[PDB]
C-alpha cells in the first residue's frame, strides 16, 4: 500500500465535516488546482478544419 | 474439414440498385451467423446498423428460405416500437441489411446491470413493448422469439423490437418456449403473450421464471406451469403475470387487453426514462 500517494477518506478516521475549511476565491482555487494532480483530457480546437 | 474460408467484408458497402455507399464503421456485435456494424451513408451521413450475412451460410434452400422470410416480414413493418427496416441488398458474398441503430443496446444488458427494476420502469418498458406487439399482431405477424435481448433501446430509451428470425405472418429454438409449442399442440399469437409474461416476471423479480441450470427441468416446469411469484411482488403485478403465463393459451389475455390491466392503469407510469436507467435506479 506504500505506493498510495493519496486516497479517499476512510470514514472511520476522516474529519467529520468540512466546517474547518475556508472557501477560497475562485482564482486561487484555479491556480492551486493547476498545481494539483489532474487529467482534463483537453482535446485541441481544429477551427472548423 | 468442412468449411470454406470466410470471405472478407468490404470496407464500403454499395447498393447498386440505389447507388448508395455505406462506410463500414465499428463492430456492433454478432447475432447468429450475421455480424453487425455501424454503417454510415456517405452521401447523407445518416448512421445505421448493418447486418452482414455471409452467403456461405445461406447455401441450402431452407436457409435462403429462412433469410428471405425474415426480410420480407421485417420490411413490411413500420412502427415506432419496432426496429426500422431501411433496406437490403447483396453482392456475391453477402446479404447486407440496413437497420435503425439502437446505440443503447438491449434490455438484456439493462437486466444484467440492474437486475430487478422498479415497478414504474417495468410499466414503461412493458407498455412500449406491448404497443409493438399490438402492431405486429394487428399485421398478423407472430414474433415467436421475444426476449430481453431483442428489445432494443435507442438513445432516447425508446424500445425497439427486433430479430424477426423466427417470425411468421399468418422453426429454430425460441428463448422462452410456450407450453403449447413444447406439447406440440401447434400455436398462435398467444405464444408472444407467454414470452411477455416471462419478460415482465424477469423485469420485476430479477431472474427468469422457469430457466434453471438444467434444460430438462426448465421444460418440465414449463409443461407443468410450475413457477412461483415471490411474495414481495405486489398482487396486481403478480395477477398480471399469472394471466400472461397461463398454461392454456386460450386463457391468456389478448394483446389488446394487456394495457388496460390494473398494473398499467394504477401506479406511477413515467412516459420517458433517462439513459441513467441503463445502469442504476432513477430519481423517484
Amino acid at each position: 500500500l506504500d505506493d498510495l500517494v493519496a486516497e479517499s477518506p476512510r470514514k472511520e478516521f476522516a474529519r467529520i465535516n468540512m466546517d474547518g475549511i475556508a472557501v477560497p476565491d475562485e482564482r486561487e482555487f484555479d491556480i492551486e488546482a493547476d498545481m494539483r494532480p489532474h487529467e482534463l483530457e483537453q482535446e485541441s480546437d481544429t477551427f472548423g478544419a | 474439414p468442412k468449411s470454406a474460408p470466410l470471405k472478407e467484408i468490404p470496407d464500403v458497402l454499395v447498393d447498386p440498385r440505389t447507388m448508395k455507399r455505406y462506410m463500414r464503421g465499428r463492430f456492433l456485435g454478432k447475432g447468429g451467423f450475421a455480424k453487425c456494424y455501424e454503417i454510415t451513408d456517405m452521401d447523407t451521413k445518416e448512421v445505421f446498423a448493418g447486418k452482414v450475412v455471409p452467403k456461405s451460410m445461406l447455401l441450402k434452400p431452407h436457409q435462403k428460405e429462412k433469410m428471405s422470410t425474415e426480410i420480407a416480414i421485417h420490411k413490411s413493418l413500420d412502427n415506432p416500437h419496432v426496429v426500422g427496416f431501411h433496406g437490403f441488398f447483396e453482392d456475391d458474398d453477402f446479404v447486407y441489411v440496413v437497420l435503425e441503430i439502437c446505440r443503447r443496446r438491449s434490455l438484456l444488458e439493462l437486466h444484467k446491470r440492474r437486475k430487478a427494476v422498479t415497478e414504474p420502469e417495468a410499466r414503461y418498458f412493458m407498455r412500449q413493448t406491448i404497443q409493438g406487439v399490438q402492431y405486429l399482431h394487428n399485421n398478423r405477424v407472430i414474433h415467436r422469439n421475444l426476449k430481453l435481448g431483442n428489445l432494443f433501446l435507442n438513445d432516447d430509451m425508446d424500445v425497439k423490437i427486433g430479430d424477426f428470425g423466427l417470425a411468421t405472418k399468418i422453426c429454430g429454438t425460441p428463448n422462452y418456449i410456450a407450453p403449447e409449442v413444447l406439447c406440440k399442440k401447434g400455436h398462435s399469437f398467444e405464444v408472444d403473450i407467454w414470452s411477455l409474461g416471462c419478460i415482465l416476471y424477469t423485469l420485476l423479480v430479477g431472474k427468469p421464471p422457469f430457466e434453471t441450470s438444467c434444460l430438462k427441468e426448465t421444460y418440465i416446469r414449463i409443461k407443468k406451469n410450475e413457477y412461483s411469484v415471490p411474495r414481495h411482488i405486489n398482487p396486481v403485478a403478480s395477477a398480471l403475470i399469472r394471466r400472461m403465463l397461463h398454461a392454456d393459451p386460450t386463457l391468456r389475455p389478448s394483446v389488446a387487453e394487456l394495457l388496460t390491466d390494473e398494473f398499467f392503469t394504477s401506479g406511477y407510469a413515467p412516459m420517458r426514462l433517462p439513459t441513467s436507467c441503463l445502469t442504476v435506479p432513477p430519481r423517484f
Binding site: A14, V23 | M157, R272, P274
Partner: protein
C-alpha cells in the same frame, strides 16, 4: 460485492494466462454490447484540502469531499444528489439547499468550472457516484457505486474500465479508441501481452481497493 466478484473474475482470466498462446485471437473476445454506460472523463485530486472532483462521460460532475460525503451535479447544471456520511442519498437543486451544504456547493461549482472546456425524462436522471479512489505515481483508480472500476495509466494516457456485472473490460488506447471484451472470451481466445499485463495490474489495484477499507 462488486469488488469481490470483480476480483474473482480477474483471478480467473489471469490464471488462464491469455497472452501465453501460440496464436492470439483477441478480436473474437470483443463484445460491444458491454460498453460502459458511464466512465470518468476527468478528475482533480484536491484531497490535501477539499477532496477529489471528477467529471463523468455524460458531463455530470461530482466531488468526494474529505468528510466522506459526495455531491453530484447532473449535466443540466442544476439537479444535485447528495450522499451523506451514512450513505443516505438526498435529491435537491442548486437553487435550494440546506445552509450546511453551502460551502460544498461553492466547492462543487469551482471544480465544475475548472474542468469544463432538458427534455422530458431528464428530470429522472440519477447517477452513480464515486465510492473510493486511490492514486499512485503511475496510475489512479476509481470505484463507482455501480461496480465499475476505472484505472487510468498516466504514462501512455490509457484506461481500463472493468465491470463485474457485465463481466467486461474496456481498454481505451492512446488514440482514444474504446475496445470492450468479455473476460470469459479473453479466457477462450486470448489477448495480447499488453492487455494481459494490464489485467494482472488491475487485479493488484482491486486488491489495494479492498485492503484500504
Amino acid at each position: 460485492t462488486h469488488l469481490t466478484d470483480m476480483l474473482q473474475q480477474l483471478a480467473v482470466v489471469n490464471a488462464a494466462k491469455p497472452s501465453d498462446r501460440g496464436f492470439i485471437r483477441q478480436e473474437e473476445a470483443e463484445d460491444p454490447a458491454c460498453i460502459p454506460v458511464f466512465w470518468i472523463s476527468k478528475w482533480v485530486d484536491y484531497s490535501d484540502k477539499y477532496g477529489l472532483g471528477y467529471q463523468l462521460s455524460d458531463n455530470s460532475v461530482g466531488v468526494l469531499f474529505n468528510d466522506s460525503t459526495r455531491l453530484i451535479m447532473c449535466a443540466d447544471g442544476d439537479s444535485l444528489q447528495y450522499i451523506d456520511r451514512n450513505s443516505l442519498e438526498s435529491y435537491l437543486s442548486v437553487r435550494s439547499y440546506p445552509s450546511a451544504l453551502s460551502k460544498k456547493i461553492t466547492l462543487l461549482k469551482y471544480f465544475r468550472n475548472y474542468m469544463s472546456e432538458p427534455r422530458e425524462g431528464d428530470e429522472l436522471t440519477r447517477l452513480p457516484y464515486l465510492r473510493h479512489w486511490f492514486r499512485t505515481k503511475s496510475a489512479i483508480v476509481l470505484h463507482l457505486s455501480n461496480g465499475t472500476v476505472q484505472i487510468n495509466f498516466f504514462q501512455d494516457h490509457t484506461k481500463l474500465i472493468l465491470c463485474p456485472l457485465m463481466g467486461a473490460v474496456t481498454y481505451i488506447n492512446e488514440k482514444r479508441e474504446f475496445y470492450t471484451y468479455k473476460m470469459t472470451l479473453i479466457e477462450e481466445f486470448g489477448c495480447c501481452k499488453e492487455l494481459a499485463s494490464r489485467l494482472r495490474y488491475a487485479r493488484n489495484m482491486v486488491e489495494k481497493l479492498m485492503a484500504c477499507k
